[PDB]
Structures are given as C-alpha cells and as structure tokens.
Amino acid sequence: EQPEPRTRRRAYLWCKEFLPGAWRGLREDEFHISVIRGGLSNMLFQCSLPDTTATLGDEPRKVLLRLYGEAMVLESVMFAILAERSLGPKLYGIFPQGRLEQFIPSRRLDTEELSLPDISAEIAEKMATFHGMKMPFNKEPKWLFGTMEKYLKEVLRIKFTEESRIKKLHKLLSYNLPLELENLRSLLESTPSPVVFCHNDCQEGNILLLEGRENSEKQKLMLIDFEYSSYNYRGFDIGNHFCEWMYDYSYEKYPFFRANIRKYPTKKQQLHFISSYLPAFQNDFENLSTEEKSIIKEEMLLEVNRFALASHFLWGLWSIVQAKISSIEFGYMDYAQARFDAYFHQKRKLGV
Amino acid sequence: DEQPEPRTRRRAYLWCKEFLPGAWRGLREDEFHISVIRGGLSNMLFQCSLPDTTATLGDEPRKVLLRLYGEAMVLESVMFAILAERSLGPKLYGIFPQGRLEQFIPSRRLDTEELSLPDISAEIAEKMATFHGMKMPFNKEPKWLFGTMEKYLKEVLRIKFTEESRIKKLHKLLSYNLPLELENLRSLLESTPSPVVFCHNDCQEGNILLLEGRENSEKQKLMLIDFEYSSYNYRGFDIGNHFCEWMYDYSYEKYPFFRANIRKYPTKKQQLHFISSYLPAFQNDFENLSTEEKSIIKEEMLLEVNRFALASHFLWGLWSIVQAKISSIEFGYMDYAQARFDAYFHQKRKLGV
Numbered sequence A: 001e002q003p004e005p006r007t008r009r010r011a012y013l014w015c016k017e018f019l020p021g022a023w024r025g026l027r028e029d030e031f032h033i034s035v036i037r038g039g040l041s042n043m044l045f046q047c048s049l050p051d052t053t054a055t056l057g058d059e060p061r062k063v064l065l066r067l068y069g070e071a072m073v074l075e076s077v078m079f080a081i082l083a084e085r086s087l088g089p090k091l092y093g094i095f096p097q098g099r100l101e102q103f104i105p106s107r108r109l110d111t112e113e114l115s116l117p118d119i120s121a122e123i124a125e126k127m128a129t130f131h132g133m134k135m136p137f138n139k140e141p142k143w144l145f146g147t148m149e150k151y152l153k154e155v156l157r158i159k160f161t162e163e164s165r166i167k168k169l170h171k172l173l174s175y176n177l178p179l180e181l182e183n184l185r186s187l188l189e190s191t192p193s194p195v196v197f198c199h200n201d202c203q204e205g206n207i208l209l210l211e212g213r214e215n216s217e218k219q220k221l222m223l224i225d226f227e228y229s230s231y232n233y234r235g236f237d238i239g240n241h242f243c244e245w246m247y248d249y250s251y252e253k254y255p256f257f258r259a260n261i262r263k264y265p266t267k268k269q270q271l272h273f274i275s276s277y278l279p280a281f282q283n284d285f286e287n288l289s290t291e292e293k294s295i296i297k298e299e300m301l302l303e304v305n306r307f308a309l310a311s312h313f314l315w316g317l318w319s320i321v322q323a324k325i326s327s328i329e330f331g332y333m334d335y336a337q338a339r340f341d342a343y344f345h346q347k348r349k350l351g352v
Numbered sequence B: 001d002e003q004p005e006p007r008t009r010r011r012a013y014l015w016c017k018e019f020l021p022g023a024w025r026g027l028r029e030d031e032f033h034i035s036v037i038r039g040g041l042s043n044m045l046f047q048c049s050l051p052d053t054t055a056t057l058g059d060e061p062r063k064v065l066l067r068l069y070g071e072a073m074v075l076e077s078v079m080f081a082i083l084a085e086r087s088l089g090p091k092l093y094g095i096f097p098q099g100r101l102e103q104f105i106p107s108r109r110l111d112t113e114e115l116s117l118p119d120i121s122a123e124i125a126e127k128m129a130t131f132h133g134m135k136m137p138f139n140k141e142p143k144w145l146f147g148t149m150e151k152y153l154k155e156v157l158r159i160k161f162t163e164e165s166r167i168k169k170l171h172k173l174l175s176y177n178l179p180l181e182l183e184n185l186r187s188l189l190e191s192t193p194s195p196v197v198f199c200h201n202d203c204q205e206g207n208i209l210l211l212e213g214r215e216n217s218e219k220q221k222l223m224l225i226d227f228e229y230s231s232y233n234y235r236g237f238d239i240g241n242h243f244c245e246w247m248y249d250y251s252y253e254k255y256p257f258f259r260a261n262i263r264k265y266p267t268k269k270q271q272l273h274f275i276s277s278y279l280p281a282f283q284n285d286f287e288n289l290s291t292e293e294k295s296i297i298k299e300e301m302l303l304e305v306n307r308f309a310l311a312s313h314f315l316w317g318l319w320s321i322v323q324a325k326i327s328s329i330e331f332g333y334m335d336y337a338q339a340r341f342d343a344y345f346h347q348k349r350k351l352g353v
C-alpha cells in the first residue's frame, strides 16, 4: 500500500532531515515508503533506503514513521528514557506531526499464545523488570481511581442517539455503578499492593515476538506501547494481563472481539506466571524458605485477582465513553457488557 | 537561608513529596527545608532538602534543585532527559507543567577571567567535542542560525522605542544597513565549510560549572549546563561563540551590567591550545595524522571559527535589541547590542573580510 503523494513528500523530508548517514543526501525519487497501519489516529509507515544504496556508518537502513492523530510532554520523555535504557525501540526523530523509531522485525502475539509456559514466564520477567525502574513521574497511585471516577462521571452524562445503544447503556447503568465503584474501592484499599511503574495495558497486541529469536527460551519478546504507563498498583498490571487471556481483538466480524470466561488462567497457570515474576522483581526472593515463598505467592494470587476487578471496571467504563467519541469500527458497548459480565463473575469466584 | 513566599513553599513541598522516593514520600510540610538560589519573573531556582536528622531509605537524594518555569517545550524536555540518562547533564527526578526537579550539583559558575586558564580552556574544548559527537533525535538541517537571525532582524525593523536614549541607540544601529550586512554574512558563511553537529549554542562561563571537590583534577573538573538553546548547527558557531565570551563579563554591578573588552579575545596561541584539545576528543584517530595534515586542519579551523564568530556577534546583537523592547530584566540591552556590533566590525577588519 502507498500513501497520497503529499504525505509521501512530507515523509521524505522528515527522514532526510532527521536521519544521519546516507539519508542526508537522499533524493525524493530513491525514497521507499509503504503502509503498515492507516486510519485517523496513530498511522504507521515503513520508510527505507533502496537496496542498492550503502550506509556510511551505523545509521538504520529502515525505520518506522508514526504519525500522530501535558500528556504530550510526558509520553515523549518516557519514550526517550526507554529508548536510552534499551527497553524500547530507539528514538530517531521527534516532530509535532509524529516520530521516527527503530523498526523491529516481529509480529504481535496472538491471544492463545499468552498461556504457553515459556511465553507467560517471559512476560512476567519483562513486567517485573519494567516495574522495578525509576521514572521522573508522579509516584502517588492516584491514576486508577481518579480515572475510574472521571469516566464514571462522563458515563452518567451520555446520551446516545441510536435506540440499541440507549438500551445497552440503560442495562449497564442498572447495576448502580457509583455504588459498585465504592465497593471496589473498599475492597482494594484493604488489599496491599506496592506502587510501581506499570505498563497498564499489557495485552498481546503490545507484545512483540522478535524475528529470528523464536528458538530462544527466555529472550524472544519485547513489551511496547507505553502510552497508558504510570505509577500504579502492581496488582492492576498483573490482574489486567490475566484478564487479557479472555479477549481476542483479531476477530473479523462484528463486534470485532471474542470473549471467553473459561480462558482466564488456572491457579496453576497464575502460579507459573508469578513464580517468574517474583525472583525478577525482588532479587532476594529465590533464597527464602519453601514455606515463606508459598505465603508470598498465595497473598499475591489474592492481590492480583482482586485488582483484576479494577481491570474489568475501568476498561468497561472506558469502552462506554469510547462508544460515544471513537470513530474506530468496534462493538464498544458489547465489549463494555462483556467486561461487566466478567466483573460480576470474578466477584462470585472470589466471594467478595 | 533566604525563604520563599509560604504559597511557593507549599507547592514545592508537594512536588518533592510526590515525585521523589524514599524518605521524601513520608515527609511532613514542617520538615521540608527550602531556600532560594535565583528569583525574578522567569526560571526561578530553589534548593530543596531533607533535614539533616532524617535518614535515607535507599539511594534517593538528600538534596535537589527545583526549577520553576516562566513544540519547543517538548524538545527541551526530551533532550534534558536524554542527557540525564547519558550522565552528561544533571539527573532528572521529576517533570511537571510548572517546572522540574533535578540533581543538585555542589559547584559554582566559572568567572570570565578563568576561561583563559590553559587547563580550564582545554577541558571546555574536550566537553564541547564530546557534546558535538552525540546523536540526538532532532532536525539536522542547520537552518536555526540564519532562520533565527532573519526572524530577529524582521522584529528589529518593526520596533519603536518611546524613550529618547533607546531611540538614538537604535537609530545608530539601523545606520549600518543590517539587512544588507546579514546577506554579506550569509555569503561569507555559505563559503566557509563547518560540519553540522549538536551545539550548545551558548557556551559561556555562566553555563559552566566548576564541580565542588574536583578542583585538583586536571581534566575532569567541569560540567556544561543549560541546554535550552541547543540544536544542530555549524560547529564554528559553538567555538566562535565561546571565543567571543572571553570578552564579556556579565557580573558587573553597575549599569549597564556588563563590561566588554576587545583585547580579551583569545590570541592565536590560546585558540590553538583550545582546538588542540578539541580535535583529538572529536576525531579519535587525529593524533596519528601527519604533522602537515594536522596543521592544515588546524589553520582552516581557525579561519572557520573566527568567521563564525561574526555570526555570534550578529545574532546576539539582534537578540539584545529585541530584548530591549520585551525583557523586564535589569540589563543595558542596547549598550550590549552596540558592543556586539563594535566587535563585529572589529573582527571584520581583523579578517580582511
């Protein structure tokens, strides 16, 4: 797929002006560009040198161009920090209309792969590593309930025009969400979880399987797409990831997802995950007694399964608001209903 | 121990409490120590610290610097962060809309007279060289120099002062036909090769820290700071501008709040000492070239930096005229403009251009 000749021009100039080596002397007629994702918000292109052109130093042959649609400053700083620490794609250029990033040959994981033991173990290690790092952002964990409050308030003010959405919203408001948010607050306020640097969206579509490295046991993945990252309760990040075993966003018919409550990880599979996470997050952990390890692990199961409720609640509210304001083709209200179904199922499973 | 207003004191307390880890997280407003370093109307600095009696819980700092602020805002933050990660600037502890929290570095600024000490001059060159060699995610077309001179020239032509002395001083400055002089400087510089590199663009004594404790180190006692004017730019501008700064001392206490001295510009000898440290630190093979090839590079570099020095005078001269209209800061801006243009014409005569 080719873009319009006007974006093609703009892109040529960005690469020419921002990238060093052979790129600096490159002519419009030798510029290769093609699409990866299009639309109206976060559009991706692969830009490259022609195969016949030689590099002059260590510049990339090929790069990723990301066109964009307080928060703008924070996301850029963080993208740069991760790039410097080699935990994210390198940052090659930053401008108002977009940015230029390392191109990493890879594919996203499919939902079904999240439960493969070796995949699950590595995701845990990465998340653990990510949780341990220092970032220059606010460390009060106010984003979880602050955000749930903000969306709840919008949700109560929403008037849809189409009858089917009006009906679906009416079924959702029937649960008395402001009362349910307070119950979830008191449950989570009594559930200790250390505040750490969370990804907050650790789903299959934000996990890259790296080309070439498929045979590596423990080093085949990269976490990406940190736009929702913040300091937050650890339980949310793990609980949210566990929830993601149940949703597959690649389904081609409406509503463009498939949900399965029986795909939530078993106790066994949860233990496999936290057995990799704990040593990578608390370095002394491997040298505790058998019995002390079991205690930590059992309290962690309770922790993450409780915070899983906040994953369902938050993304459910989010999705209702998106049904009003997003143009993207997705059955947002059906998804909201699926998250609230799972919420009430998980409440029953926990006895809370 | 000079204290800020109780409202800034409270804001600052919250920022430190919320952004810094360890003992800071549990700290009470009444246990917060803060004092001023710089005040005014724009970029205000405070030293914030834990009380001496409080213990740290890990590797958090006891003491930090709070910087209150007055496209460019995104790029400056990214760059401050990049330099922090590479240990070429103060560590970044917190970033918020009203300011940021940075490593506090016990130090003083250099004085103008210290720029010419051989060991100081040599290290400045090494640091600038290191700085020039870095990859940064910014535009690499060197359009900021003339783009900026054009932009200020255009403002300068539209300025009406009301007070007589400023009117007179502006009139003397416009007498030189600045739009014609800018074109002559363009054609001179278009014929002067200079590699485009990552420039500080303001490498003056007040942006160079002498690090406390390290005074006895020969080659590692300084840090370059304050990169808000940084960009990809001609290498000649950075070196030429630093050479120009040997002539200006901004610490004079009476109006016009600077002193200028044309005879303090570095000698050819002192310039060679500077570029003799810069070259090996920027091109690592440099020491193993032939004697004759080294001399050629060095002599062309002298011509390069002394020619770009003209752009230092021209740019800061125009900048200063514009500041005389819009800055509230106490400084003889028009006198400074005249001093930079005097130096410009003197440097033109020295070069035979």
Ligand SMILES: CN(c1ccc(Cl)cc1)c1cc[n+](Cc2ccc(-c3ccc(C[n+]4ccc(N(C)c5ccc(Cl)cc5)c5ccccc54)cc3)cc2)c2ccccc12
Pocket (backbone or CB within 6 Å): A068, A069, A071, A072, A073, A075, A076, A094, A095, A096, A097, A098, A143, A144, A147, A200, A227, A228, A229, A230, A232, A236, A314, A318, B071, B072, B074, B075
């Ligand atoms: C201006 N500019 C730019 C200008 C000049 C130059 Cl030289 C370069 C760049 C630009 C830089 C970067 N971008 C990329 C970008 C992508 C996403 C966002 C984004 C969106 C909304 C929000 C708030 N928020 C909502 C929901 C949460 N959700 C859903 C949420 C999820 C989980 C939890 Cl626990 C809590 C909340 C949540 C979460 C955490 C933090 C914030 C959150 C934050 C960030 C922001 C920027 C640009 C994009 C478009 C246009 C310009 C851009």
Ligand SMILES: CN(c1ccc(Cl)cc1)c1cc[n+](Cc2ccc(-c3ccc(C[n+]4ccc(N(C)c5ccc(Cl)cc5)c5ccccc54)cc3)cc2)c2ccccc12
Pocket (backbone or CB within 6 Å): A070, A071, A073, A074, B069, B070, B072, B073, B074, B076, B077, B095, B096, B097, B098, B099, B144, B145, B148, B201, B228, B229, B230, B231, B233, B237, B315, B319
């Ligand atoms: C929004 N926000 C913020 C928002 C959200 C969060 Cl979470 C955190 C922060 C903020 C971030 C950072 N700051 C600090 C800051 C202040 C000014 C600037 C700056 C601006 C405009 C300009 C133009 N320029 C002039 C002259 C040159 N001069 C004189 C010049 C010198 C030499 C040469 Cl060769 C050419 C020109 C030159 C040079 C290069 C580039 C630009 C130049 C320069 C600097 C850079 C950062 C904020 C300040 C106030 C309010 C908000 C701020």
